[PDB]
């Protein structure tokens, strides 16, 4: 079968064949559109078609599909399938699935870059200090200085589910949130449940506005322990405005690396359950989502007073004219102290390229609409004009649920 | 089996059970979601005339009644007899009420009830229709106290005596392609705005002049009328702060009038029902001021700024949109034109699907298009999880009349 998605501002048709390969689920029926909700052991059984499929995919890519190598390979793997219940990925193997579950992530207008992506294998770890050190330099090479650089460092897959590996952060840097007694919070909120954790797991909170948070790490499935980033690791980022002088005395500042830790890496059937991961920063995710959300820092009216807008009535558009400085603001700060940026404009129009080239090259491109366009300025932006296809491929990063839900305590 | 949708910014779960009446197709499989996609006899006719007598009698707490099954009978019968059937009045105003009810792309819905129903089924010729159109225009701009309004006309037999009107909406200006190749005028309706010249309109050429009405009674050809400009409510567009927007020469009007959907009730076909209501503030600063394939202005209005116009990191862009978008609101606001900003228009629709969940249990809407097309986040329905499914009675598309119509 063929499916069309049409440009409805250049008229350009694609054509998507690669929706055939699908083999995950949407949500969605004939009956009703899922398109918006947000959150929608392994058999030996289910367990050696899965490595099948991606070994045919591997070899395929490389050339060699229906050779001595790729039978001898599907031979090796199921053997040890029914041997051991499970499979260890050669390290070629394992850089082409965390590429590939990247590309295949259709919620990421970043994926022009998914072929560079370096590949940290640290499935010889055993221990959270281990885990720690892994961290620490994931941190070093990815921040470069400023020159940002895509990781991801690979923890040892699930075996039984009962000693995983989990970083129990959701974001390897990311700035605590304390509820005060008088129903205010001092931080971030949405770190709130993770910093009471952090607590009274023993850390010490300085209890500041931007304090970074300590790593808790899980090893082998026993209990998480606390560590602290050295604080020389961590850039962060002033934020001034160009114009507006009393901007920087607005006390904010932001981290540099944008590194995802909660997430799980699937490749062939196999789960990897702590796989952190980083790139650089869209502008929008900061000035328009962490700043101006409601339910975040929530600046709007303290900028939007400072500016001495109308803020009397909504139709003003004083949020919107409040929303757009802050977002220069970020994107001036960061490229004026070298720290790898991209604004939603660049970003949403070399997406549109990288999309085009993955339909001639691929047969197609996944893709979330509802995630892609961005959170401000929408349709000046060419993906908002762009019809796109959801689907699931594997390899790929799924959601799992948060560890403090699921974990036995050994004391 | 039942649904439930949250709220990610106030945590305010809903549960959806209305679904459950859900009878047409989503675009949607278990393999593909299809959400960012633009486009989609006797024995058929009477479950679809039930189904609809139905939830009609049910609204009106006689379900099971006598009276009810009366009407079911005499209905059966009629198509039967005719092979069609025609709505009393009452069930007409219910379902041109509930296919805005079910539009699960409006934002504008909470409203849904207050709309005026012109029946219009008594119409025979283009003339008649003009005149029609005509008393739905002045009752609706009520002098700029903008009134919900739909005219009805007659439904379609066998499909060649279709009643249509040609114009996407009945209120929109002509689009004209220049000797440059560039565009005077609005770039959306050059193929339109050449059929009215290629059926007899004598064009001003001019950038925003108003498109005369093509009118197809009874399945005829098509008649070209001139709307009274005296019922033509417009807009000048300054700025209540840069003195030199005035100047750019913008306007438009206040009439948002849709014209060429498909009014679905109980199984009959509506082909020509134009309906109005008022604009949301963005339609025209984000959309049709600065959209691409449109006035595409934003360059020119950053020009005027003085903006740093050589990154696209300075958000120029952004900034002048937030302008234009400003100067719309103020022009309407200051001549006392019906209009709503994005930020006011969300914030009623939240209210209204909270309370639609707990009067009718739940709310079909496609986020894609209820989440406005500036400043997103920063307005309530962007956190909003939202189920979209089709119900009846429903407006859907139907193809443009001028690759279909035998001269
Ligand atoms: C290098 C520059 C990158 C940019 C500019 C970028 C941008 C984004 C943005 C804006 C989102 C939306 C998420 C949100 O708004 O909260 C997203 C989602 C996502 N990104 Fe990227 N990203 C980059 C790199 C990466 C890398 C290196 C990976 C993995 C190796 C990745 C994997 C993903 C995945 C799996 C999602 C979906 C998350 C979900 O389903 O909730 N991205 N990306
Ligand atoms: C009274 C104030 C109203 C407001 C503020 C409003 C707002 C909107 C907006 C912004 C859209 C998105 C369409 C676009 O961006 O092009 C929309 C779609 C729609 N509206 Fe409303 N509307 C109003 C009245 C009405 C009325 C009176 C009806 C019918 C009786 C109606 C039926 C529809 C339908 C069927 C769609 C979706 C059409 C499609 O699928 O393309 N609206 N509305
Ligand atoms: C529910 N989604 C928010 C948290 N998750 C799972 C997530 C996953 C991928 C990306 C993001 C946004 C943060 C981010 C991460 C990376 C690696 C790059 C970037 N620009 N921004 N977030
Ligand atoms: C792609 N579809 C756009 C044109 N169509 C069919 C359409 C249908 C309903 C509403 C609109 C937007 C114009 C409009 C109409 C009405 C009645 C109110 C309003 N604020 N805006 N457009
Ligand atoms: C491709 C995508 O479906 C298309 O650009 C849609 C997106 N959302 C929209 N939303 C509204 N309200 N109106 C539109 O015309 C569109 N266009
Ligand atoms: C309910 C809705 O799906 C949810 O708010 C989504 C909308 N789109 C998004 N898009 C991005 N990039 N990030 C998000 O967190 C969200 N949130
Ligand atoms: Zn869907």
């Known amino acids: 079968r063929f499916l069309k998605v049409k440009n409805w501002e250049t008229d350009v048709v694609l054509t998507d064949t690669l929706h055939l390969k699908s083999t995950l689920e949407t949500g969605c ?89 370096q590949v940290f294998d640290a499935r010889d770890c055993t221990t959270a200090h281990g885990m720690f050190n892994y961290i620490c330099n994931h941190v070093k090479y990815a921040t470069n200085k400023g020159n940002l650089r895509s990781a991801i460092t690979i923890f040892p897959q699930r075996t039984d589910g009962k000693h995983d590996f989990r970083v129990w952060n959701s974001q390897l840097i990311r700035y605590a949130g304390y509820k005060q007694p008088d129903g205010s919070t001092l931080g971030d909120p949405a770190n709130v449940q993770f910093t009471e954790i952090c ?132 994107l001036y700060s960061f490229q004026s102290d070298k720290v790898t940026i991209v604004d939603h404009h660049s970003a949403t129009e070399s997406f549109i390229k990288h999309m085009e080239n993955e339909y001639r090259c691929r047969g197609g491109c996944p893709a979330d609409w509802v995630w892609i366009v961005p959170p401000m300025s929408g349709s000046i932006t060419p993906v908002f004009h762009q019809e796109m296809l959801n689907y699931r491929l594997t390899p790929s990063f799924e959601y799992q649920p948060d560890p403090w839900n699921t974990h036995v305590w050994k004391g």
């Open 199 to 330: 607590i009274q797991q023993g850390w010490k909170a300085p209890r500041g506005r931007f304090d970074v948070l300590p790593l808790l790490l899980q090893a082998n499935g026993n209990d998480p322990e606390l560590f602290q980033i050295p604080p020389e690791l961590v850039l962060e980022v002033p934020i001034r405005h160009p114009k507006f002088d009393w901007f920087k005395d607005l006390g904010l500042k932001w981290y540099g690396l944008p590194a995802v830790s909660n997430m799980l890496l699937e490749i062939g059937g196999l789960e990897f359950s702590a796989c952190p991961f980083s790139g650089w920063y869209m502008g929008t995710e900061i000035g328009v989502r962490d700043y101006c959300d409601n339910s975040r820092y929530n600046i709007l009216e303290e900028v939007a007073k400072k500016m001495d807008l109308d803020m009397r009535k909504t139709s003003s558009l004083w949020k919107d004219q409040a929303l757009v400085e802050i977002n220069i603001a970020v």
């Open 29 to 117: 029926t004939e009956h009703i559109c899922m398109g918006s909700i947000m959150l929608p052991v392994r058999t030996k059984d289910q367990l050696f078609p899965l490595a099948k499929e991606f070994l045919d995919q591997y070899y395929s890519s490389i050339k060699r599909f229906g050779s001595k190598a790729h039978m001898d390979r599907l031979e090796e793997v199921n053997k040890e399938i029914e041997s051991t219940s499970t499979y260890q990925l050669k390290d070629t193997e394992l850089i082409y699935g965390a590429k590939h579950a990247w590309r295949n992530a259709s919620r990421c207008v970043g994926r022009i870059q998914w072929s560079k992506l």
